[PDB]
Design a protein around this ligand. Structure first.
Ligand SMILES: [Fe+3]
Ligand SMILES: [Fe+3]
Length: 306
């Protein structure tokens, strides 16, 4: 009667040719109407509302499928001259949707490969459009979700890799994919991530510490998962001086996971701990002493101010 869709796929200026419903007290409540769009301030209709899944009429699923495919085809097209924020709105949401699909169906080879291919397209988008990174970084994680945070971390990771001279396309694709999926271990956790680690209850901190271990264990023997991705999921909370959950030091880590660890630490401060982005580098240095390579912190600070 109804089928679910991910809210991350409702983006940009294309007019929807379907209704969409929000579930309230187990009923499907009409919220978006045929003809609606979501460019610019219109996106506010989908923000700050903890919207993850919405629903469409099964009879309109074909309209929705074509809507989504047109959005992504148009947004990745570098020849359109289309507004960069609208392209970023669509692409950021598509990346988030791809991650959510993998988190919900980690056994699905097709979904993983789709996410992987799209991570490559994302690298190209960021690399080939001067203002793409800045546009994506304009898209605030209002609901503090792990999928949105994955996209942000992947974005910081791509730029950091560029600043470090990591050029290998295979490596950048795996870096991006690993960053996208890095917090798989938090999927369906009761933990409220939107609080500072250092002031979490002992119970919450203990729960938090489990996530990279549990996440990696679940996917490590799945053949379709790339080893680098498994490494990033499992090692991204490790710090170079051995203070993270597994106690790894830099020499023990996948180098790409060290990058993601740095990029993650920054967004956790900015998005989950309410730290102003200009102060985030200092905070890592004086509150996360020796946890991440200074060159990463310096580069990330530079990326954040443009
Ligand atoms: Fe994490
Ligand atoms: Fe994270």
């Amino acid at each position: 009667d109804y089928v679910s869709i991910r809210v991350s796929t409702l983006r940009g200026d294309q007019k929807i040719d379907f209704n969409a419903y929000v579930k309230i007290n187990d009923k499907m409540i009409l919220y978006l109407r045929r003809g609606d769009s979501f460019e610019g301030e219109r996106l506010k209709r989908l923000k700050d509302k903890k919207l993850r899944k919405m629903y469409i009429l099964t009879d309109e699923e074909n309209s929705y499928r074509t809507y989504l495919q047109k959005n992504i085809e148009t947004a990745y097209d570098d020849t359109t001259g289309k507004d960069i924020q609208t392209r970023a709105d669509i692409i950021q949401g598509s990346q988030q949707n791809n991650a959510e699909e993998v988190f919900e169906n980690p056994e699905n080879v097709e979904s993983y490969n789709y996410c992987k291919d799209a991570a490559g397209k994302y690298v190209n988008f960021i690399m080939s459009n001067a203002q793409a990174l800045s546009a994506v970084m304009n898209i605030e994680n209002t609901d503090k979700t792990i999928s949105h945070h994955g996209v942000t971390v992947s974005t910081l990771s791509i730029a950091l890799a560029q600043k470090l001279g990591i050029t290998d396309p295979k490596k950048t694709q795996l870096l991006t994919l690993g960053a996208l999926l890095h917090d798989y271990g938090h999927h369906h956790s009761p933990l409220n991530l939107n609080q500072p680690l250092d002031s979490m209850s002992p119970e919450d901190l203990a729960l938090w510490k489990k996530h990279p271990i549990e996440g990696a264990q679940k996917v490590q023997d799945k053949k379709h998962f790339d080893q680098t991705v498994i490494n990033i999921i499992g090692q991204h909370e490790e710090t170079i001086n051995g203070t993270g959950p597994k106690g790894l030091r830099e020499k023990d880590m996948d180098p790409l996971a060290v990058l993601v660890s740095s990029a993650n630490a920054m967004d956790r401060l900015i998005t989950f701990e309410g730290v102003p982005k200009a102060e985030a580098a200092k905070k890592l240095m004086i509150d996360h002493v020796g946890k991440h390579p200074l060159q990463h912190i310096q580069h990330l600070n530079d990326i954040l101010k443009g």
